[PDB]
Amino acid sequence: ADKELKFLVVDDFSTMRRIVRNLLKELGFNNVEEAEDGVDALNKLQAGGYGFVISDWNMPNMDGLELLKTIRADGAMSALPVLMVTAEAKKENIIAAAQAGASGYVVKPFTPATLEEKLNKIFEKLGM
Ligand SMILES: [Mg+2]
């Protein structure tokens, strides 16, 4: 994928945002911004230019599933890739995420190799 691809990393835990941003740096993606919940995320996305979202599942104000649904219903962002991150895999959340249009779902903490693999599989099915 274009290494200038602009990511938005969404998590209420500033520490995890830092970690994910650094994992992306380790993969050659330097163009990354952060958001602290689903509402903040939408405010940042409105500026345009974003090509990928990585979002935590449980957040106050607007959670990850609601963010995903809002993204998917939007004209401009309808096809914006969204990778959902969760502290623990729950079969019901996986289904809900998939049927709501999630591009993928990963359990944290994850290694750089795992993130790379998730992103690459998403890039490959979307032709990025
Ligand atoms: Mg959280």
UniProtKB/Swiss-Prot annotation:
Matching InterPro entries: CheY-like_superfamily (IPR011006), Sig_transdc_resp-reg_receiver (IPR001789), ST_Response_Regulator (IPR052048)
SMART domains (alphabetical): REC (SM00448)
Domain Response regulatory stretches: 6-123
Subcellular location: Cytoplasm
Positions carrying 4-aspartylphosphate: D56
A single GO molecular function term of this UniProt record: acetyltransferase activity
Record annotation: effect of changing D12A: No effect on magnesium binding
Subunit structure: Interacts (phosphorylated CheY) with CheZ (via C-terminus).
Record protein name field: Chemotaxis protein CheY
Organism: Escherichia coli (strain K12)
Gene: cheY
